Structure 1
Amino acid sequence: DLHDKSELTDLALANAYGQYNHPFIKENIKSDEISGEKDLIFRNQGDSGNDLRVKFATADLAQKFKNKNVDIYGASFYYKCEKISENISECLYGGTTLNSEKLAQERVIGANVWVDGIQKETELIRTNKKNVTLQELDIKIRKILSDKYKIYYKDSEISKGLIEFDMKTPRDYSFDIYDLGGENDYEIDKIYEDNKTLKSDDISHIDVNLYTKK
């Protein structure tokens, strides 16, 4: 069931590596401009003053954040990002939460890691948001995985990977780290388009299982 790293093109690997190592993080910005019916526009708010277009799965979502002070944390990209002006538009799916919703205290989540069934050091990620997007937690975990296990380097020994985010109830979410939508970010990141958010204090822990080349 777990997809193999060898299934991905070089473009897909370079793109994955790029976004999990350089996420777009912006705090307290507001947009009173919808594009299409489900994209919010933050002119000149992206990298290099490029414009920023945050895409949502529904107009329901875009409206919810329209004219709200929001925090952004997601995987950004340019290719296929619909321009709003004659200037370069930078894109990102979901990764949006209200800036007013901060925890009374920093939530640290433990991430157990296994490589071929052998327990490695438990890793840590944290957030100060009451409702954190799954995208944010995922990027934070993949960053550590990229740093320590070189998950997105073509010639590293890791070839299969599963990340499990467990709640305090029997609810869990998971990502096969190599089952990418396609090779371009506009495809790959639709994985975050629903802006799925989790109640930070209800998260139990993360379980990561990687398997070496075979």
Structure 2
Amino acid sequence: DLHDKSELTDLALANAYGQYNHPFIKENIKSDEISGEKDLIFRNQGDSGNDLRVKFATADLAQKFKNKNVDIYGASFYYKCEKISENISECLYGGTTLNSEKLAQERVIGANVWVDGIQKETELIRTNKKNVTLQELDIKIRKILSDKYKIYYKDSEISKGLIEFDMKTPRDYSFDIYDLKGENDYEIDKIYEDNKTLKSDDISHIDVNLYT
């Protein structure tokens, strides 16, 4: 039972359309500043000079990355992002991996895609990270699905969709693309606050099934 796009508000759709098409990506930056037990602050490193607040589910996660060089890839937002200082604060959940943890060669993952059961062109996503967040993978697939199938347009035909990430062992992860937790990003993106990370070389493939 997949959620229908009709259940979403115009604001939820517009927010999803914006964030999945414009991921926040930063390579090799470092915060030695914890805020509110569970957040790391990167001053001046958000978009357009803004400060970045990266939010984690736990103090242990924030502490793991404190004073480490990291790469960030995640969905960013402003509304309800807790103020840091005088500069504008931009936020993101998780999306964080150690910059030193890199593969010997790029991993390219293929996604088989179907719309009403009809097979569409394979989609390809890639990473050089030894450990990659599930958030990054999800965003890279939703970006292509948005580009090609307009999944977050209000009037486009797609009304249901599931993305499944399968490992080389019997373990998978999945996202129902219309099961948004709220209409604002600060709530929607909490699905990434666990900073869930997968070993890139243990990922097998991705399945995308969309329906009208």
Which TM class, normalised by the smaller chain length?
over 0.9
3-state SS in 1 of match to 2:165? strand
Give the match for residue 67 of structure 2.
Answer: 67
Distance 2:151 2:55 in 1: 27
Distance 2:133 2:206 in 1: 14
Structure 2: stretches of 5+ with no match in the other structure = none
Distance 2:22 2:136 in 1: 12
- Provide the identity percentage: 100
1:1-55 C-alpha deviation (Å, 9 max, x unpaired): 1000000001000000101000100000001100000000001110011000000
3-state SS in 2 of match to 1:145? helix
Q: Within the alignment, does 1:83 sit opposite 2:83 as a pair?
A: yes
3-state SS in 2 of match to 1:100? coil
1:61-82 C-alpha deviation (Å, 9 max, x unpaired): 0000000000000000000000
Q: What's the CA shift for 1:166? A: 0.1
State how 1:13-28 maps to structure 2 within 5 Å. Answer: 13-28=13-28
1:97-149 C-alpha deviation (Å, 9 max, x unpaired): 00000100000000000011111111100000000000000000000000000
Q: Within the alignment, does 1:105 sit opposite 2:105 as a pair?
A: yes
3-state SS in 1 of match to 2:91? strand
Give the match for residue 12 of structure 1.
Answer: 12
Give the match for residue 122 of structure 2.
Answer: 122
Give the match for residue 40 of structure 1.
Answer: 40
1:153-202 C-alpha deviation (Å, 9 max, x unpaired): 00000000000000001100000000001000000000100000000000
Paired residues in the alignment total 212
Distance 2:203 2:186 in 1: 28
TM-score in terms of structure 2 length:
0.99
Give the match for residue 131 of structure 1.
Answer: 131
3-state SS in 2 of match to 1:79? coil
3-state SS in 1 of match to 2:121? coil
Q: What's the CA shift for 1:87? A: 1.6
Q: What's the CA shift for 1:94? A: 0.2
Distance 1:143 1:5 in 2: 17
Distance 2:12 2:178 in 1: 9
Give the match for residue 202 of structure 2.
Answer: 202
TM-score in terms of structure 1 length:
0.99
Task: Provide the aligned C-alpha RMSD in A.
Answer: 0.4
Distance 2:48 2:163 in 1: 32
Q: What's the CA shift for 1:86? A: 1.7
Distance 1:4 1:65 in 2: 37
3-state SS in 2 of match to 1:122? strand
Q: What's the CA shift for 1:205? A: 0.1
3-state SS in 2 of match to 1:182? coil
Distance 1:162 1:12 in 2: 18
Distance 1:171 1:77 in 2: 30
Structure 1: stretches of 5+ with no match in the other structure = none
